[PDB]
Every structure is written in structure tokens, then in C-alpha cells.
Design a protein around this nucleic acid. Structure first.
Ligand SMILES: [Ca+2]
Ligand SMILES: [Ca+2]
Lengths: 218, 223
DNA sequence: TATTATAGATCTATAA
DNA sequence: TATTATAGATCTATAA
């Protein structure tokens, strides 16, 4: 997929270039994953698939030694049970759930940083938060990049948090044929069990002259 | 219901006694609201009902001159569309949705306070966040009071926010005969359309053992 | 009348 | 098996 980046608290210079390369190469090679909506007025319309996207990232990063679902130490258990990925002093959250998760993930990363919790045998120094662009139709209230950017930009204007955060937005060019993975799961909602998966070409149609696009496959 | 409170940034010294009395009396008068779960393997079991509880609070506070769903100003539109209630300088959020909403609600309230957002023709001075105690069985991942307490306590330790916040936890005694409002809605999930509502007798069964902590949630039974 | 953006409701996934 | 705890998925409600 294509990507856009916004950095906070100097993450551009603090983030280890090699660790960033490992995350970036994964995101750039990844096809857009889509599935059918089960929302009442649009059953069957194609939407961004967080399940397939999350699994794709996990399958690429774990073999590169990024530990998945690292447990959060007991002393900070009120902040959660685990973190998506971590390697050395860098935490990664892939966040396609509802929008308040952006501020929950940001604040707990701030506390992980202030208290020096160990990520992967090193104290936490930087967080990477991966999100999807507004351009893709998706479940209602799922977080999107521009909303995350606007929220963190406002927190930065008021000097609210200090931890370095690289915010990543997954995007595609509009009206251009791209690689897509289209999946049908065993149940119309929540299931992560694949029933059918197709690798195809498709595109995101733009009706703008911002509205979200419409995904089509061939 | 009974209430437990935790104040941050001296919300106790800042909160107008009369505004607090209007919120407190409403919450104290309110019976515990329950409904049937549709979660696998516990279909029909009673759980805390956020729909009925939210409606009860709205029906009590609006007549008391609290404004409901106050729009958030354009310059902060990326923080949201509106706030649950407001009266003069006080904002109130009733939060029974999933746990990340606590930090979303805390952080945006911090930003409203820094910029001095008008709430009801007056700059915001304090926020009240209403939550339900852990003791009640409820939808998975719904926010609960002790979790909000522990998170805000950590933020306070690290000086993350300066806005005064009164955190309220709705609770009840265990193994005590209490009145409970039981509501049935037109669909098994998400509906706010009431098909039947009644006040019944019930209690919250304490399922803790010597090896749990008190992290064992209660079981609600009605008669 | 149809979209869209929250806000709120509340399920399943998964491991301890 | 049973349950607790998120974390993630993703719907409906309801007012622009
Ligand atoms: Ca995630
Ligand atoms: Ca609310």
C-alpha cells in the first residue's frame, strides 16, 4: 500500500532507521485488503478489511523478530493486557478499531515511556501507530488517519504528550488499478476464519471534484 | 444507586455544590437498570443496561436545566460533535461504551479546558464522568469505574492533565434486596425501543471465592 | 429522502 | 470446561 507519515516529538530523528525500514517495507508491499460490509444500508459493499490487514502485518513482522502481543507488566495492567508488536525499544500499534482507541493508545504509550517499561529487553522510546486513510469505506467509527492526525496535531499544539510517535496512514492512489485481496470469512461479522480469499486487481473510484471512495474489484 | 467518587485536580473544591446536588440526587434515586445479554453462552443472563441508564439520566437532568448533546465548537470538531450534558461551567459525560472512551473523553476535556470552551454560556471549569462499577456483569470491554480510577490515577501521577474531573462510579451492595428496572427492547442488540419495562425485586449475587480477588463480577437475579 | 460523522452498544477472538 | 480481561470488529441510533 502507499503510506503517509506524520511525526510527533521528533520521532523522525529518534526512530531507529533500520526498525522503520522493517515496518515500511511490510506496509509498502502489502495489497489493500477488503471484505463485505454487513451494515444495514450497504450489505455486501466492499470495505477496508481490518482482519486481513492485521493478519498480513502479523505474518510479516513476526518472522522479522517483532514480537506480537507482548504482555503489559503487572505494574501497568490497568493500561491493558498487551501491545501489538515491539522490537528493541520500539512499540507498534495497528489500530483499525473505534476512534477512541487513538487517544487510549497514545496515552498509554505516553505512560509506557514515562515509566520506562520494557518492550523487547529495552525501555520504550518510540511508538508507531498504523491507521487507514479516510479514503476507504469502512465500518462506522473505525479510526482513520486524518482524524488521528487532527487529534494528535491538536495535542501537540497544546504540548500535551512527550513520547515520540510516528503516525502512519495507509493509502492508495484513486482511479488506478491496484492489487487487492478480497476475503469472505465464515460469518458475516467478527469472524477471522477465512472461507474464500481472492487476489485480484481493483481500484478505488473517486467521485470528488472529501468523500470516501468506492472500492471495486475485477 | 450508591456512588463512589474520585476527584482529580481538586474537582471537589471547584464543583458548584448545587450543580453537584442535581447530579447526585438523580444518581441516588435511580434503580439499577438491567437487560438480557446476547453474548454467546450467556444469552438471557442479566447485565447492566447502558441504554436504560443513559435514558434515565437524560430524563432526570433535562428538566433540571442541564442541556443535552451540546455541540462542540468548529475549532475542535476533530475532537467530536457533542458532549452529553452541560450546565453553566460544568460538562458531564455518561460513559458505558468501550474502555478507550475514558481516555478519549479525558483528553478532549483537557483540551476544552485549556482553550476555555464555553459549555453553557460560561467557560468550562470542571468535568464529571459517570461510570458503572466492576461489580456488575456487563457487555465485554465496557468501561468500569475501577479501571477509569486506575488510569486517571496514573495520568495524575505524571501530570498529564490539569482539568478538574469528578469521576463517579455507580455501585450497589452485594447480597442485598434491591429494586431493579428490567427492560426488554425490540431487538436483541442495540435497540433503544422499549417493548416492556418493569421494576422488580432482585439482588447481586457475590460469586467471589477466597482465591478470586474481588475481580469476580456479581450475578444479577430478579424475582 | 439519502449520506456521513460521531456516539454508543455490544458482539466475537483469544490467551491466561 | 468456565471465566476474566482486554483488544478488536463492527453493528445500530440519531441528528446534521
Ligand atoms: Ca491493534
Ligand atoms: Ca456518553
Amino acid at each position: 500500500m502507499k503510506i503517509d507519515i506524520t511525526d510527533y516529538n521528533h520521532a523522525d530523528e529518534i526512530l531507529n532507521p533500520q526498525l522503520w525500514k522493517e515496518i515500511e517495507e511490510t506496509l509498502l508491499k502489502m495489497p489493500l485488503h477488503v471484505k463485505a460490509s454487513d451494515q444495514a444500508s450497504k450489505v455486501g459493499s466492499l470495505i477496508f478489511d481490518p482482519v486481513g490487514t492485521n493478519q498480513y502485518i502479523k505474518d510479516e513482522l513476526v518472522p522479522k523478530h517483532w514480537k506480537n502481543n507482548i504482555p503489559i507488566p503487572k505494574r501497568f495492567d490497568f493500561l491493558g493486557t498487551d501491545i501489538d508488536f515491539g522490537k528493541r525499544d520500539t512499540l507498534v500499534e495497528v489500530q483499525f478499531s473505534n476512534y477512541p482507541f487513538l487517544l487510549n493508545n497514545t496515552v498509554r504509550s505516553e505512560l509506557f515511556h514515562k515509566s520506562n517499561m520494557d518492550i523487547d529487553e529495552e525501555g520504550m522510546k518510540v511508538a508507531i501507530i498504523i491507521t487507514k486513510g479516510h479514503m476507504f469505506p469502512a465500518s462506522n467509527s473505525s479510526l482513520y488517519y486524518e482524524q488521528a492526525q487532527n487529534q494528535l496535531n491538536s495535542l501537540a499544539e497544546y504540548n500535551v504528550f512527550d513520547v515520540p510517535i510516528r503516525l502512519v496512514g495507509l493509502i492508495e492512489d484513486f482511479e488506478t488499478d491496484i492489487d487487492i485481496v478480497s476475503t469472505t470469512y465464515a460469518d458475516k461479522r467478527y469472524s477471522r476464519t477465512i472461507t474464500k480469499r481472492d487476489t485480484v486487481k481493483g481500484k478505488v473510484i473517486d467521485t470528488n471534484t472529501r468523500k470516501r471512495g468506492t472500492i471495486v474489484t475485477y
